């Protein structure tokens, strides 16, 4: 009864806000240069991944648990959500990321705060190289999300939340060495806003993840497992007036 | 057939006593300053999470496997358990934590004993900051618990025990840096009793987790996925006389 | 058609032999003092656990996947298997552990070989203190096994293999500091035969685990979730003549 | 309508190529000597394993998700796939490994490139010893794979993808110390071609993994769980003309 005007839509947008707040808080907080014991690569990798896995499990049934502007955009291109759901989700994700980083800023002691765990290019490498890396990291993540959340799947699914979570961990085990690992425009945007700190190569953390995810969406939803759908039904999905 | 008098209820209370004993024993025992090899952050975090994850799987069918007064009180507020089940569970949890911490004291060598892994603030974290952190830590946990044990769930659940387990691990990966990570007033209370060691900040490890869990319950059960029910049925739940 | 004469029984005894060989090989192999990169506590605990988890998944459907004399004896006392099945399994497990430890001895370089990762009591720990620890370590494991493999379970079980595996990992995260972590008489026995090195505290690695596992069986099968059966039926299980 | 010619087959070959590309990229990428933070044993092992778990979850429904010439050949021997499928999968796997290694070479900084994480025999290990290790490592993996993907299984399977994945992690926790851990001829071939360097022991990374997986297939499909097909049916599978 009008997609945008429903209580379900209000709960979904709020859930996207809340999930991204919690994600960023946990992600950045585990990555700070704590004097007591500097976090290791695997430590940070599992922290980010377990945050997504926990949040996917907890708030996934409310909104779909995107928690990531690149994932949301790819689902739009692959014809899975409406334009307006995409807009509100992305908006909620960026606001959530800012809040999460802001809350972290207010609780972290001064010796730990540092750069608030912003993404940083590895200066032994170039923009183009780093962007290719982020394209790959987000590509495998996206592909795993689409495969784990496809209601058509007949292969035993296991735990979608834990599979998706551990894909985030995988991305970090390589990506940290290149860019601090983004895979998520909101993860990069949040702390950059709170610390008023945008590096020249900030575009990498938007273009890489988005292109990676969208490529996975094209591959998955259009080449590997296409669906039925008339053109008018495809237009209806974009508008949010599709009756299945 | 009169809740408090049933064999089921007796087993439930025993299981909450036993689960907290084993949890606290393993948790604290993994976190001591073993001179042979000092436990790392990730190592401690996984021990706490796998303990909860193993105990959820093993004893959860008996009692619901709360293993945590903050969670028990949250489920009361959310109208899921009776007042008497709450009192007995909390009592069983506190006594169990003391038993586990006591058993550890009796087995651990002198060079490893230390302060028996009591909770303690970072020397640069204030009580106010610690408070907000514990709230967030227990909030994500409670939310993951309620989502993973909801009978109404249609989303593939995966493993609720391991999801809840890894959500605890998630908590520790940030929490240890602030308060040694509590998320659980019984976990804080057990070693504090055995060592007769209550820091001024001890209240944080009670209020922080309880408020965090209660907010998650209010959100989950009254805002996101309400049950409705008549006000006489709600009262019947509190008094232990509700029939489905 | 006669238990010991069935093809299924032969496959089962072989499976227990093979699983224990592979388990002990991976277990000990991961724990050698490799000079290029000394294995960390978490490294070893995960290896042991992932070994059991992988072998439960792969060979459990053939034999039950005990891979542990303590578990087998516990299932005998809990009236789940026959006496003759118990005898052959233990035999196969002990022989398997010698094979695995022997094979590792054959491939490992001497700069890493050391004691072939035999169990050893911590200097600062009495035999009796190690006794209580080994009891508890094996107790939580057995309890998790019985809960995860119970065909009466209505609770989402998730992955019994991974849950059981991670329980082994949990055991090592504390137990390594006390005894190198046994939980398994065959695991202690294997390298001790190959190295011809039996420590004074060797009985601990038998009594601790066996007592811990048996207590868990009594608790689970006779107190928490019993099955009321006639005396003659119980005797029929022991003799291997029972028909459900 | 002729196996090789179908749309499904074309996708399956591509999926194997893409899976091996991504696998090798992440695997080698996680293993480079990054001077800022040298990857730990457990760090590398989880990267490799989680790569397989993620790719098995994502692309397994498309191809069977072999990502490994040893597994593919084992499945041919075990009468599970056609000769033509085995040929194209192996070919696609090897081309994918080169592509993945090639892409890493293009993005990795000079200070971390090193040997591009080619497998390398331990100086203190003989070729014959490394041979036995690789046999055992791939044996346990193949066994886990066949048990987890058997549609005749009644025991709860849990997460096939993650069980297989963590089996790979298990392989590495022992294998890295001997050979850098191969378990997969493509994984060894890829960077060897790109770097134009083949070790004297390179055959071990082929023969070891292939023998181990084939033995596992003979044990699983002909000794433990046979299917009793007629000889004409077996020949039909080999030719890809089998109808169930
Ligand atoms: C690092 C450790 C990773 C541990 C991964 C645990 C894998 C989880 C894992 O193994 O989950 C397996 C799920 C599969 O679902 P199902 O069909 O068995 O249950 C019915 C199902 N449709 C439902 O109702 O949800 O098991 C649920 O209990």
Residue numbers in the entry:
A (entry chain B), B (entry chain D), C (entry chain A), D (entry chain C): 2 to 245
Quote the study's own text.
The flux of water across biological membranes is facilitated by transmembrane protein channels called aquaporins (AQPs). AQP5 is found in tissues such as the lungs, airways and secretory glands and consequently plays a major role in the generation of saliva, tears and pulmonary secretions. There are two consensus PKA sites in AQP5: Ser 156 in cytoplasmic loop D and Thr 259 in the carboxy-terminus; the latter corresponds to Ser 256 in AQP2. Based on the crystal structure of human AQP5 it was hypothesized that phosphorylation of Ser 156 could cause structural changes in loop D that would break its interaction with the carboxy-terminus, thereby flagging the protein for translocation to the plasma membrane.
Since at this resolution, information about side-chain positions and interactions is limited, we truncated AQP5 S156E at Pro 245, the last visible residue in the high-resolution wild-type structure AQP5. In the truncated AQP5 S156E structure, seven water molecules were observed in the water-conducting channel of all monomers with one exception, monomer F, which contained six water molecules. In both structures, a lipid molecule could be observed in the central channel formed between monomers in the tetramer, albeit at slightly different positions. Similarly to wild-type AQP5, this lipid was modelled as phosphatidyl serine. Since there were no significant differences between the strucutres of full-length and truncated AQP5 S156E, we used the higher-resolution truncated AQP5 S156E structure to examine the finer structural details (from hereon denoted as AQP5 S156E). No structural change of loop D was observed in any of the eight monomers when compared to wild-type hAQP5 and the interactions between loop D and the carboxy-terminus were conserved. The carboxy-terminus retained the same conformation as in the wild-type AQP5 structure. Comparison between the 8 monomers of AQP5 S156E shows that the carboxy-terminal helices overlap perfectly, suggesting that the shift in position arises from minor structural differences between monomers in wild-type AQP5. As is apparent from the electron density map in Fig 5D, serine was successfully replaced by glutamate at position 156.
